[PDB]
């Protein structure tokens, strides 16, 4: 077995990554936007003492009073706090401070039935390490924090009945991975949710400290939007479907006032009813992880698509 | 006597379960809300900030929670109408209680949009001045420009004299100060087929390039100013210039769907009410495919409904010029029409139907209306199919049922009471039958049905008795029943004339 | 054929020329639609100023050529009186 | 600088700017630089050059910020373009062409047919779109004797005689219906805009009419080589924009960043690499497994493998004490700890050869290196050939770099 397309040697391989350095350094065998890559995943990252250190390196920390700016704009120590007491297991401390620090507005509008949960595992696995009135106790605390959170969608529904059953007894679940999991998705939902402040402090208050999340160049979202096409356009063709049933519709069923808001959505809960899944992923969700994360997973993905397709190339090493 | 780490605990212990918070709201431990309703002028900021984020949490609760508790709801909504005087107090009270107020205040119409709200006034004054001082001098905090935004989303929720020469001057200033930072990106390159000019520019169906606002507090400033100055400005300029429809026809191709449906609600104005506009086709021609891609997003807005403006723009074409129509022309070439009949034929045909479904289905029919009110090709398109007719007569049954079985229940019954669920859906049907009996050929071959006569007689006799009798409901029950009267006298002055055989 | 669409294309307005051309076709019955020897059409003038119709009638499978002649039905009262409809 | 991304824009295509073709002309741009070297002055230089100038004007939108807030408040052919810019004039004398060759297009009953001037690469591009203007008609007014779409490359009288032959996609004005067909579209007439696009990720021909996109005509057209082509009977004309001199109606930017997001949608959502263990004889062979790369987020080995490429950057730029910092915040945040102790190692060992006395750049370089390799051997999708080619959609300096 051998690949059959192409099998670069060392020296045209070399070529072809010379080529295409140069034509990258032009744009921008050296990259010059390594360094805001690595301060970009040190402050998205959470990390204290580096995040300081790369931006007095790269130029922009230049007093204690600046530092104290710099950590009050990113949040890193109140982030890293969050992560270290979800990491932890202090659940119920996360949310005191995500709800004092960072305002009700987060939890109050998916990532709470991940912290319940996770809350619920951790004091069973507490109880059953280290009987009645602990164990009504606990049922209560499944029955009453989680009921309508579980009762509203089919995979809640199953995924407290799967931890309901592995409760009854003497991988992912038990996993410590789970909570790392949890504190990078609640890190990636604070940080989109104080982006526009540090863009409104960078922008109108003339701070020379730099944003980055996202460049002036390219655009961004604060929502999320999915464009469902084939639905009404004129993608379709110039024919006429036909009703199909002669059911009935009744059969399958100085004061100031404002307006009624119920039912304005109709719309799209009966197109819901009535190549694919277009949205706006990139320019909405896509900026709010660490880059070099991105790009290893391009390597990834290129190095085994490169694989697949009977193309032998040299690895890095 | 509540402290503030009280309070502090309170709020923390509440949030997520809403259980909880039922328990406040039915225990008789609810003597807090006197002190959640006594927000003393004296009191401390930290405390009145504690205060008003304790009322945000409480009522804070899912429509199944507020109809276990009741109307204590919605007394303690009122008396937050009533009792707290913080509106008063606007421009002496911090940003911090200014936007928590406002907060609470969106929350409460929200969920109780029947009663006044008596404070109006005072709460544009402090708008006013919020904006013309701070705002547009370039003095303004993070708390003040979300109090703006909270008070334009405020406002917009009205339903509805020299304060609105001030209030559209204030939005004036907003949008010219906001829209004149990316006033650059305009760039269209085109052709006049008779150099730095902008002569002929209304001559390509081209737009300029996609113009981008990248702050966010920005773009949703622009929005909701700019729709609040669509509601303003014709009772006291931007719309004449060309920079500024230039701008908007680029602000058309945009990612936020806000910014869009904002765009298109700005362009399709002048149309219903500025004369001889509607002469001007190439504009529409411009617009129509960014709206006919407005359909097809999931997350939309409020205040936007494309089904109301096709049918706004179509009856206006219709009442105008009813031998020609650009509209119905412009999107039968490029395959629209038929796949609207086609989402019309598949909602008619679903197999469980809820209220969201009724009401698009209301919408579907009402544009099928409209489609063939003054030409005979859609008008026989439409009744080529044989299954329209049947669901027209089971729809008036349906109403014709339900109005008897109201009639036959007035004495247990018997004051505001909730109009009948399908009154819409059966003044649509009437305006289908209206436009398919405006021509001879139905009237003498396809509407021969005596059905649908004997419908129209029983409907107009039966409204009359519950006019004539069941007079207690109110107007809110009555209105679309007289409604209801005029189209079907409508309906049937147009089948009483002498050459139709009913 | 080019040469009198090219020519056509100039015409003023139809309503102020003296004659109306037009083209007649039969749809159903009139008494009772449901209780067809009317598959061709009728190629037909009409002269505004005297108000008489002449025309030919057309079909394939049929003779050729068939005139109609019409005249404006004189009445037995000189006097007038307008009667009015409108579909609403 | 700024000046040469104006006259690249005010050269080139806006949409093409935006995919991975763009290198080529920015080559293209920087080789032929001495030709060129506020954008009013870059305009007016270009209109002296000649862009914005023929004969029918070439009109510039400008706009007035300054009284806006005071009142409220062939060169293409010197430069080496390999892309269709113009129609190709027929030997035979049967056509009538303008200067530039798109402005005007009449015949002078048999179809006169021609194509453009130059063919599409299979393994170079994303999406190419064109568009035609119908300006006079010889019947009814929306019927047209016109025939516009794209012609394979390896029956020209069998194209004069009938309109198209087997190796024509393309769009009938003449009855709304496509040439190798069903219901698809209705006849266009005077003043339409109809324009023809392919898309090389999943491989498909479309055509739009005034703006509105009409679906796909034709499907799985991978691997192949196109040329735009044009049939007209005597009678009636058509203007062509290629993009270079005016702006486009349909909005064709909206589909590359529906596309591209797609993509990126799709693929984005021991801890030491050592040597290469394929080099066996001094040639590389394939090892009989489904990946090589075996490295995930969900497992820990990415972070681990990518906190190491950072501490062994950070050590070989000169920046032990940044090093020191990040090795003790992931003391912090704590196979963990073998990427702590060998950090560890890292530092005493570059302090003891500072006392005495990359990798990342590598993947960076290696990511651009076989996203071109992807793109020019014509990879296939996923398993099949029919399948999206989504590396097609990635510009990796202007969409994850910056």
């Given at each position: 077995?051998?690949?059959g397309k192409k099998?670069?040697?060392?020296?045209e391989?070399k070529?072809?990554?010379?080529?295409?350095?140069?034509m990258?350094?032009?744009?921008?065998?050296?990259?010059?936007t390594?360094?805001?890559?690595?301060?970009?995943?040190?402050?998205?990252?959470?990390?204290?003492?580096?995040?300081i250190r790369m931006?007095?390196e790269?130029?922009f920390?230049?007093?204690?009073k600046?530092?104290?700016?710099?950590?009050?704009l990113?949040?890193?120590?109140?982030?890293?706090?969050?992560?270290?007491?979800?990491?932890?297991?202090?659940?119920?401390?996360?949310?005191?401070?995500?709800?004092?620090?960072?305002?009700?507005?987060?939890l109050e509008?998916?990532?709470?039935?991940?912290?319940l949960?996770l809350n619920?595992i951790?004091?069973?696995?507490?109880?059953?390490?280290?009987?009645?009135?602990?164990?009504?106790?606990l049922?209560?605390?499944?029955q009453?924090?989680l009921?309508?959170?579980?009762?509203?969608?089919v995979?809640?529904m199953?995924?407290?009945?799967?931890?309901?059953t592995?409760?009854?007894?003497?991988?992912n679940?038990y996993?410590?991975?789970?909570r790392?999991?949890?504190?990078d998705?609640?890190?990636e939902?604070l940080?989109?949710?104080?982006?526009?402040?540090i863009?409104?402090?960078?922008?109108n208050?003339n701070?020379?400290?730099?944003?980055?999340?996202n460049?002036?160049?390219k655009?961004?979202?604060?929502?999320f939007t999915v464009?469902?096409?084939?639905?009404?356009?004129?993608?379709?063709?110039?024919?006429?479907?036909?009703?199909?049933?002669?059911?009935?519709?009744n059969?399958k069923?100085?004061?100031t006032?404002?307006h009624?808001?119920?039912?304005?959505?109709?719309?799209?809960?009966?197109?819901e009813?009535?190549?694919?899944?277009?949205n706006?992923?990139?320019?909405?969700?896509?900026?709010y992880?660490p880059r070099?994360?991105?790009?290893?997973?391009?390597?990834?993905?290129c190095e085994?698509?490169?694989?697949?397709?009977?193309?032998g190339?040299?690895?890095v090493? | 006597?509540?402290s503030?780490?009280?309070?502090?605990?309170?709020s923390?212990?509440?949030?997520?379960d809403?259980?909880?918070?039922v328990d406040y709201?039915?225990?008789?431990k609810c003597?807090i809300?006197?002190c959640?309703?006594s927000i003393?002028?004296?009191?401390g900021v930290?405390?009145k900030?504690a205060?008003?984020?304790?009322?945000?949490?409480?009522?804070?609760?899912?429509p199944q929670?507020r109809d276990?508790?009741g109307?204590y709801?919605?007394?303690?909504?009122?008396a937050?109408?009533?009792?707290?005087?913080?509106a008063?107090s606007?421009?002496k009270?911090?940003?911090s209680?200014?936007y928590?107020?406002?907060?609470?205040?969106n929350?409460?119409?929200?969920?109780?949009?029947?009663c006044?709200?008596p404070?109006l006034?005072y709460?544009?004054n402090?708008?006013?001045?919020?904006?013309?001082?701070?705002?547009?001098?370039?003095?303004?905090?993070?708390?003040?420009?979300?109090?703006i935004?909270?008070?334009?989303?405020?406002?917009?929720?009205v339903?509805?004299?020299?304060?609105?020469?001030?209030?559209?001057?204030?939005?004036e200033?907003?949008?010219?100060?906001?829209?004149?930072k990316y006033?650059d990106?305009?760039?269209l390159?085109?052709?006049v087929?008779?150099?730095?000019?902008?002569?002929g520019?209304?001559?390509?169906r081209a737009?300029?390039k996609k113009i981008?606002?990248?702050?966010?507090?920005?773009?949703?400033?622009?929005?909701?100013?700019?729709?609040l100055?669509?509601?303003?400005?014709?009772?006291?300029?931007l719309r004449?210039?060309?920079?500024?429809?230039?701008?908007?026809?680029?602000?058309?191709?945009?990612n936020?769907?806000?910014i869009r449906?904002?765009?298109?609600?700005?362009?399709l104005?002048?149309?219903?009410?500025?004369?001889?506009?509607?002469?001007?086709t190439?504009?529409?021609?411009?617009?129509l495919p960014?709206?006919?891609?407005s359909?097809?997003?999931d997350?939309?807005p409020?205040?936007?409904d494309?089904?109301?403006?096709?049918?706004?723009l179509?009856?206006?074409?219709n009442?105008?010029?009813?031998?020609?129509?650009?509209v119905?022309?412009?999107?039968?070439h490029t395959?629209?029409?038929?796949?609207?009949?086609?989402?019309f034929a598949?909602?008619?045909?679903l197999?469980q139907?809820?209220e969201?479904?009724?009401k698009?289905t209301?919408?579907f029919?009402?544009?099928?209306?409209?489609?063939?009110?003054?030409?005979?090709?859609?008008?026989?398109?439409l009744l080529?199919?044989?299954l329209?007719?049947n669901?027209?007569?089971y729809?008036?049954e349906s109403?014709?049922?339900?109005?008897?079985?109201?009639?036959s229940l007035?004495?247990?019954i018997?004051?505001?009471?909730?109009p009948?669920?399908?009154?819409?859906f059966?003044?649509?049907?009437?305006?289908?039958?209206?436009?398919?009996?405006?021509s001879?050929?139905?009237?003498?071959?396809?509407?021969?049905?005596?059905?649908?006569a004997?419908?129209?007689?029983?409907?107009?006799?039966?409204?009359?008795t519950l006019?004539?009798?069941?007079?207690?409901?109110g107007?809110?029950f009555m209105?679309?029943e007289i409604?209801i009267?005029?189209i079907?006298?409508?309906?049937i002055?147009?089948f009483?004339?002498?050459?139709?055989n009913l | 054929?080019?040469?009198?669409?090219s020519?056509?294309?100039?015409?003023?307005?139809?309503?102020?020329?003296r004659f109306i051309?037009?083209?007649?076709?039969?749809?159903?019955?009139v008494?009772?639609?449901?209780?067809?020897?009317?598959?061709?059409?009728?190629?037909?003038?009409?002269?505004?100023?005297t108000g008489?119709?002449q025309?030919?009638?057309?079909h394939?499978?049929?003779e050729?050529f068939?005139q109609?002649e019409?005249?404006?039905?004189?009445?037995?009262k000189?006097?007038?009186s307008?009667?009015?409809?409108?579909?609403? | 600088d700024?000046?040469?991304?104006?006259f690249?824009?005010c050269?080139?295509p806006s949409?093409?700017?935006?995919?991975?073709?763009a290198?080529?002309?920015?080559?293209?741009?920087?080789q032929?630089?001495?030709?060129?070297?506020?954008?009013?002055?870059?305009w007016?230089?270009?209109?002296?050059?000649?862009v914005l100038?023929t004969?029918q004007?070439?009109?510039?939108?400008?706009?007035?910020?300054?009284?806006?807030?005071?009142?409220?408040?062939d060169?293409?052919?010197?430069?080496?373009?390999?892309?269709?810019?113009r129609?190709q004039?027929?030997?035979?004398?049967?056509l009538?062409?303008?200067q530039?060759?798109?402005?005007h297009?009449?015949?002078?009953?048999?179809?006169?047919?021609?194509?453009?001037?130059?063919?599409?690469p299979?393994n170079?591009l994303?999406?190419?779109?064109?568009?035609?203007?119908?300006?006079?008609?010889?019947?009814?007014?929306?019927?047209?004797?016109?025939?516009?779409?794209?012609?394979?490359?390896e029956?020209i009288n069998k194209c004069?005689k009938?309109?198209?032959?087997?190796?024509?996609?393309?769009?009938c004005?003449?009855?709304?219906?496509?040439t190798?067909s069903?219901?698809?579209?209705?006849?266009?007439?005077?003043?339409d805009?109809i324009?023809?696009?392919?898309?090389?990720?999943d491989?498909?021909?479309?055509?739009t009419?005034?703006?509105?996109?009409?679906?796909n005509?034709?499907?799985?057209?991978?691997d192949?080589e196109?040329?735009?082509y044009v049939?007209?009977?005597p009678?009636?004309?058509?203007?062509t924009?290629?993009?270079?001199?005016?702006?486009?109606?349909?909005?064709?930017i909206?589909?590359?960043?529906?596309?591209?997001?797609?993509a990126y949608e799709?693929?984005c959502?021991?801890?030491?690499?050592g040597e290469?263990?394929?080099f066996?004889?001094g040639?590389l062979?394939?090892?009989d497994?489904?990946?090589?790369?075996?490295?995930s987020?969900?497992?820990?080995?990415?972070?681990?493998?990518?906190?190491?490429?950072?501490?062994?950057?950070?050590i070989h730029?000169?920046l032990?004490?940044?090093?020191?910092?990040?090795?003790?915040?992931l003391?912090?945040?704590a196979?963990?700890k073998?990427?702590?102790?060998?950090?560890?190692?890292?530092?005493?060992?570059?302090?003891?050869?500072?006392?005495?006395?990359?990798?990342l750049?590598?993947?960076?370089?290696?990511?651009?290196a076989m996203?071109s390799?992807?793109?020019?051997?014509?990879?296939?999708?996923?398993?099949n050939?029919?399948?999206?080619?989504?590396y097609?959609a990635?510009n990796?300096?202007?969409?994850?770099?910056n």
């Amino acid at each position: 077995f051998t690949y059959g397309k192409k099998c670069f040697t060392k020296e045209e391989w070399k070529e072809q990554v010379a080529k295409y350095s140069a034509m990258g350094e032009l744009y921008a065998p050296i990259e010059p936007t390594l360094p805001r890559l690595l301060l970009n995943y040190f402050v998205s990252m959470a990390y204290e003492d580096s995040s300081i250190r790369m931006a007095k390196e790269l130029g922009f920390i230049r007093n204690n009073k600046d530092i104290a700016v710099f950590n009050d704009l990113y949040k890193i120590k109140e982030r890293f706090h969050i992560k270290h007491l979800i990491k932890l297991g202090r659940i119920n401390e996360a949310m005191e401070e995500i709800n004092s620090i960072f305002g009700l507005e987060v939890l109050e509008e998916d990532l709470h039935f991940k912290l319940l949960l996770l809350n619920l595992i951790e004091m069973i696995r507490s109880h059953h390490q280290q009987s009645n009135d602990f164990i009504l106790n606990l049922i209560q605390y499944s029955q009453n924090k989680l009921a309508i959170k579980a009762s509203s969608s089919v995979k809640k529904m199953q995924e407290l009945e799967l931890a309901m059953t592995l409760l009854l007894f003497p991988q992912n679940l038990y996993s410590i991975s789970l909570r790392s999991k949890i504190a990078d998705l609640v890190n990636e939902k604070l940080l989109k949710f104080i982006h526009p402040r540090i863009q409104f402090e960078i922008s109108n208050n003339n701070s020379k400290f730099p944003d980055l999340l996202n460049s002036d160049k390219k655009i961004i979202t604060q929502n999320f939007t999915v464009y469902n096409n084939n639905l009404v356009n004129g993608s379709n063709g110039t024919k006429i479907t036909h009703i199909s049933s002669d059911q009935p519709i009744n059969e399958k069923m100085a004061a100031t006032t404002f307006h009624n808001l119920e039912n304005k959505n109709y719309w799209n809960q009966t197109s819901e009813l009535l190549g694919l899944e277009f949205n706006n992923y990139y320019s909405s969700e896509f900026p709010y992880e660490p880059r070099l994360t991105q790009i290893m997973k391009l390597w990834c993905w290129c190095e085994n698509q490169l694989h697949h397709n009977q193309i032998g190339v040299p690895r890095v090493e | 006597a509540y402290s503030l780490e009280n309070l502090k605990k309170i709020s923390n212990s509440l949030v997520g379960d809403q259980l909880a918070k039922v328990d406040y709201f039915l225990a008789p431990k609810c003597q807090i809300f006197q002190c959640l309703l006594s927000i003393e002028q004296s009191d401390g900021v930290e405390l009145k900030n504690a205060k008003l984020d304790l009322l945000y949490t409480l009522l804070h609760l899912e429509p199944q929670q507020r109809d276990i508790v009741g109307t204590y709801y919605f007394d303690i909504v009122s008396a937050i109408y009533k009792s707290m005087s913080l509106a008063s107090s606007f421009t002496k009270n911090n940003s911090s209680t200014n936007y928590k107020y406002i907060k609470l205040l969106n929350l409460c119409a929200g969920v109780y949009p029947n009663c006044g709200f008596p404070d109006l006034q005072y709460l544009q004054n402090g708008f006013i001045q919020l904006v013309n001082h701070k705002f547009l001098r370039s003095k303004c905090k993070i708390d003040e420009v979300v109090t703006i935004i909270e008070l334009l989303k405020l406002f917009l929720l009205v339903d509805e004299h020299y304060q609105d020469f001030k209030m559209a001057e204030s939005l004036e200033h907003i949008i010219v100060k906001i829209s004149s930072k990316y006033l650059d990106q305009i760039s269209l390159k085109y052709i006049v087929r008779l150099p730095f000019d902008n002569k002929g520019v209304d001559c390509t169906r081209a737009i300029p390039k996609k113009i981008n606002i990248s702050n966010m507090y920005d773009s949703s400033l622009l929005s909701l100013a700019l729709l609040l100055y669509l509601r303003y400005h014709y009772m006291i300029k931007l719309r004449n210039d060309a920079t500024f429809k230039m701008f908007v026809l680029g602000l058309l191709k945009s990612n936020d769907v806000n910014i869009r449906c904002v765009a298109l609600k700005f362009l399709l104005q002048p149309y219903f009410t500025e004369d001889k506009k509607w002469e001007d086709t190439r504009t529409l021609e411009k617009i129509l495919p960014y709206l006919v891609k407005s359909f097809n997003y999931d997350p939309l807005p409020w205040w936007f409904d494309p089904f109301d403006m096709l049918d706004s723009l179509i009856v206006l074409y219709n009442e105008i010029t009813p031998m020609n129509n650009p509209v119905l022309t412009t999107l039968a070439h490029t395959n629209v029409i038929f796949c609207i009949l086609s989402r019309f034929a598949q909602c008619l045909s679903l197999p469980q139907h809820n209220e969201a479904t009724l009401k698009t289905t209301t919408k579907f029919i009402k544009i099928c209306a409209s489609f063939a009110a003054s030409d005979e090709k859609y008008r026989l398109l439409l009744l080529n199919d044989t299954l329209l007719l049947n669901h027209l007569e089971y729809g008036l049954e349906s109403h014709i049922t339900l109005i008897q079985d109201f009639i036959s229940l007035k004495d247990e019954i018997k004051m505001c009471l909730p109009p009948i669920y399908d009154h819409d859906f059966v003044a649509a049907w009437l305006l289908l039958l209206k436009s398919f009996s405006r021509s001879v050929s139905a009237l003498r071959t396809t509407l021969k049905r005596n059905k649908i006569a004997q419908l129209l007689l029983q409907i107009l006799s039966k409204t009359y008795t519950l006019t004539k009798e069941c007079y207690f409901a109110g107007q809110d029950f009555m209105k679309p029943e007289i409604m209801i009267m005029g189209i079907t006298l409508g309906s049937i002055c147009n089948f009483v004339v002498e050459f139709s055989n009913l | 054929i080019s040469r009198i669409f090219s020519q056509e294309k100039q015409f003023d307005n139809y309503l102020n020329e003296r004659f109306i051309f037009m083209k007649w076709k039969e749809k159903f019955l009139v008494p009772d639609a449901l209780l067809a020897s009317y598959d061709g059409f009728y190629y037909i003038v009409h002269d505004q100023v005297t108000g008489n119709i002449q025309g030919f009638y057309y079909h394939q499978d049929a003779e050729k050529f068939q005139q109609l002649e019409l005249v404006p039905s004189l009445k037995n009262k000189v006097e007038s009186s307008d009667c009015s409809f409108e579909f609403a | 600088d700024d000046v040469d991304r104006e006259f690249i824009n005010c050269l080139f295509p806006s949409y093409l700017l935006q995919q991975p073709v763009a290198y080529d002309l920015w080559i293209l741009y920087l080789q032929h630089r001495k030709l060129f070297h506020t954008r009013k002055e870059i305009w007016s230089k270009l209109m002296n050059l000649g862009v914005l100038g023929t004969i029918q004007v070439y009109k510039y939108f400008y706009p007035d910020v300054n009284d806006f807030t005071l009142r409220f408040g062939d060169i293409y052919k010197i430069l080496g373009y390999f892309l269709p810019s113009r129609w190709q004039a027929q030997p035979n004398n049967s056509l009538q062409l303008s200067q530039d060759g798109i402005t005007h297009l009449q015949p002078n009953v048999d179809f006169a047919v021609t194509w453009a001037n130059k063919s599409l690469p299979d393994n170079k591009l994303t999406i190419f779109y064109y568009e035609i203007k119908v300006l006079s008609v010889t019947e009814s007014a929306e019927n047209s004797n016109i025939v516009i779409g794209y012609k394979l490359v390896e029956s020209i009288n069998k194209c004069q005689k009938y309109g198209f032959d087997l190796n024509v996609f393309g769009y009938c004005g003449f009855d709304g219906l496509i040439t190798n067909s069903k219901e698809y579209a209705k006849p266009f007439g005077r003043d339409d805009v109809i324009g023809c696009g392919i898309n090389f990720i999943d491989g498909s021909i479309f055509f739009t009419k005034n703006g509105i996109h009409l679906g796909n005509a034709f499907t799985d057209l991978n691997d192949l080589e196109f040329v735009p082509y044009v049939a007209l009977r005597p009678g009636n004309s058509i203007k062509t924009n290629f993009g270079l001199n005016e702006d486009f109606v349909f909005d064709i930017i909206g589909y590359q960043d529906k596309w591209k997001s797609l993509a990126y949608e799709h693929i984005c959502r021991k801890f030491l690499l050592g040597e290469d263990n394929r080099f066996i004889d001094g040639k590389l062979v394939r090892p009989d497994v489904n990946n090589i790369n075996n490295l995930s987020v969900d497992d820990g080995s990415l972070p681990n493998t990518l906190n190491v490429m950072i501490n062994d950057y950070l050590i070989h730029e000169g920046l032990v004490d940044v090093a020191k910092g990040f090795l003790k915040d992931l003391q912090k945040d704590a196979e963990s700890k073998d990427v702590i102790r060998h950090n560890e190692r890292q530092i005493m060992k570059e302090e003891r050869m500072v006392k005495i006395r990359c990798a990342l750049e590598n993947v960076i370089s290696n990511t651009r290196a076989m996203l071109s390799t992807l793109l020019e051997y014509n990879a296939f999708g996923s398993t099949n050939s029919s399948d999206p080619r989504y590396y097609k959609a990635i510009n990796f300096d202007e969409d994850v770099l910056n």
